[PDB]
């Protein structure tokens, strides 16, 4: 393990952790900017969309102009976002610089993917996958808690410390990477259209469906709960803190420890049917706390949940592909974009409504995606009994 | 148009040993690999070794597995092959070849360009 | 992983069809290429990829895929075109060529 991985993946771990740095600071700006549920519902929503948008241009241009030099670009850009995020008192710079982290995110994504492409060898096109999934799920975990644990100081440090952490992952990205200067004289002509017209594209329709649902659960709750227990139980920062990091890690620890054990008694498709099961049960018994420990723990035992199902929808695209890795994670990284955008937009616009709405969406969003892997149940076994 | 000179061969004791060379020439060396081959005379061709220089990856056939070894220097952009062991069997006419290794950017994901063998340098030979 | 083309040899005349198969007993995608070497000469690439085309070689030298199957076609057989072809397999770290196919005129 040499530095230019430790700082390829370092430039993924701070750029995912600036997603949740929002969420903590929440029970103070609904009341001091006089904001509803919709306008978090944008603001939030807003990084994964101009990361979305942005993403096949700043993968374009890395191609085209160089690998370092956008990583370097990119890493600027989302020092300056935060540091205007910081400083603008305003509805419309928090905005701005939230477009402009989006922005920043998904320029560097695809230059770092490249580099590691360009650095791993040929036969880890699967394990750097992982690799991918496990730093980016620990940055969308580790993100609310360092932003409260900062939040508890004033409003302001939690993204005067990104800012720092930018500046420095942008100086050791000048100091440590390098990518060769030459390029080829004469390349071929192919453009690859071929893999786009060898797909079968009904084959992909459930673990598609699968990652959109998990990530939409997994972006929403975090919203939902931040506003809900803000009004009903009305947390300080530093609980919320509390229960996103307790629970991201308890799910971090199970899944590193119980889901090979399950596998080996539970085919994939039943067992995320079970934990869309379990994931319902324990949101239905969420609208029922009434008290402090009670709705801290329902957090604990949510995160378990879908840190059952994101390896397993993982594993799912490794093996229904084939030796298309590259094709698995791009549609995995899209979708779960997608799914971070759907998120917190619904998870704002519904709180207004009612205070329990989001839930009652996120109950049923699980229902849809149980009962799609129990209609692709009889697919499978019409496939399994056709040929022995 | 590019070509790779390639250097070594000759009179060779069973069992001793040798260095064969393949120097680049206006080609990236950093976004490609250089793999060398064999031809028995009169017999078909097999691939021998193979090193990519940015990855750092080695390979070598299941027919000759670990007792050649394989290397390349970056700084003037050569590759060097050496021969441990020899027998009777060894004696062939090798050549030097390159396939681009480097990705590309489809949007919203990378591809890899495919393995094919652009450029080959004359072969040397080896006897014995 | 063992690959096999065949026909070892074939006799053709000038602007014959030409086929030439290769197929492998382990899925190989769709990395098999077609080299053409001269007597004497380093061989020269001819497909890189399936069904691809190469720059410089005349349109006349074709590629197929069917399954495992590997087809090379060639419409016209000029007498400049008197060589040994090979298919080769490069899905894999490891690497395979073909027999050879050397064309009578």
């Known amino acids: 393990m040499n530095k230019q991985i430790f700082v390829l993946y370092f430039n993924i771990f701070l750029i995912f952790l600036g997603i949740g740095l929002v969420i903590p600071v929440l029970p103070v700006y609904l009341k001091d900017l006089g904001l509803t549920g919709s306008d978090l519902g944008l603001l939030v929503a807003a990084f994964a969309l101009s990361q979305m948008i942005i993403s096949p241009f700043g993968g374009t241009l890395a191609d085209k102009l160089g690998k370092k030099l956008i990583i370097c670009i990119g890493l600027i850009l989302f020092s300056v976002s935060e540091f205007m995020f910081a400083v603008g008192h305003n509805f419309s710079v928090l905005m701005l610089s939230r477009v402009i982290g989006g922005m920043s995110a998904g320029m560097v994504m695809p230059g770092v993917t490249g580099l590691i492409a360009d650095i791993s060898p040929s036969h880890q096109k699967a394990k750097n996958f992982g690799y991918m999934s496990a730093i980016i799920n620990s940055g969308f975990i580790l993100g609310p808690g360092i932003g409260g644990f900062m939040a508890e100081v004033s409003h302001r440090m939690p993204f005067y410390f990104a800012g720092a952490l930018g500046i420095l992952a942008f100086i050791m990205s000048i100091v440590l990477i390098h990518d060769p200067k030459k390029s080829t004289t004469s390349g071929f002509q192919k453009l690859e259209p071929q893999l786009l017209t060898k797909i079968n594209w009904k084959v992909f329709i459930t673990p598609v469906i699968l990652t959109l649902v998990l990530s939409f659960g997994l972006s929403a709750f975090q919203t939902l709960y931040s506003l809900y227990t803000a009004d009903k139980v009305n947390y300080s920062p530093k609980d919320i803190s509390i229960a996103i990091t307790g629970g991201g890690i308890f799910g971090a620890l199970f899944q590193i420890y119980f889901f090979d054990k399950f596998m080996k008694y539970f085919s994939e498709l039943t067992f995320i049917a079970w934990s869309l099961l379990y994931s319902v049960v324990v949101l239905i018994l969420l609208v029922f706390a009434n008290d402090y420990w009670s709705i801290m723990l329902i957090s604990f035992v949510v995160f378990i949940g879908f840190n059952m199902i994101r390896p397993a929808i993982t594993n799912y695209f490794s093996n229904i592909a084939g030796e298309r890795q590259g094709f698995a994670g791009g549609l995995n990284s899209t979708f779960t974009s997608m799914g971070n955008f759907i998120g917190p937009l619904i998870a704002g616009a519904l709180f207004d409504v009612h205070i329990e709405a989001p839930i009652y969406m996120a109950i049923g969003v699980s229902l849809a995606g149980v009962v799609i892997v129990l209609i692709e149940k009889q697919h499978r076994a019409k496939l399994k009994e056709q040929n022995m | 148009e590019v070509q790779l000179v390639e250097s070594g061969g000759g009179l060779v004791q069973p069992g001793g040993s040798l260095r064969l060379s393949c120097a680049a020439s206006?080609?990236?060396?950093?976004?490609?690999?250089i793999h060398w081959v064999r031809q028995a005379p009169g017999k078909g061709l097999e691939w021998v070794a193979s090193i990519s220089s940015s990855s750092g990856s080695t390979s070598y056939a299941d027919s000759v597995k670990g007792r050649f070894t394989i290397s390349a220097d970056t700084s003037k952009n050569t590759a060097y092959l050496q021969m441990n062991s020899l027998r009777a069997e060894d004696t062939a006419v090798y050549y030097c070849?390159?396939?681009?290794?480097?990705?590309?950017?489809?949007?919203?994901?990378?591809?890899?360009?495919?393995?094919?063998?652009?450029?080959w340098g004359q072969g040397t030979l080896v006897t014995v | 992983i063992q690959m096999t083309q065949s026909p070892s040899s074939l006799s053709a005349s000038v602007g014959d069809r030409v086929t030439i198969t290769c197929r492998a007993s382990?899925?190989?995608?769709?990395?098999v290429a077609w080299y053409q070497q001269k007597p004497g000469k380093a061989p020269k690439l001819l497909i890189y990829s399936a069904s691809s085309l190469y720059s410089g070689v005349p349109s006349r030298f074709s590629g197929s895929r069917s399954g495992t199957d590997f087809t090379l076609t060639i419409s016209s057989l000029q007498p400049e075109d008197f060589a040994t072809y090979y298919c080769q397999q490069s899905s894999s770290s490891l690497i395979t060529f073909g027999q050879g196919t050397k064309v009578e005129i």
């Open positions: 206006g080609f990236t060396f950093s976004s490609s690999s």
């Open positions: 070849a390159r396939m681009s290794v480097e990705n590309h950017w489809y949007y919203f994901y990378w591809y890899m360009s495919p393995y094919a063998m652009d450029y």
């Open positions: 382990q899925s190989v995608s769709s990395a």
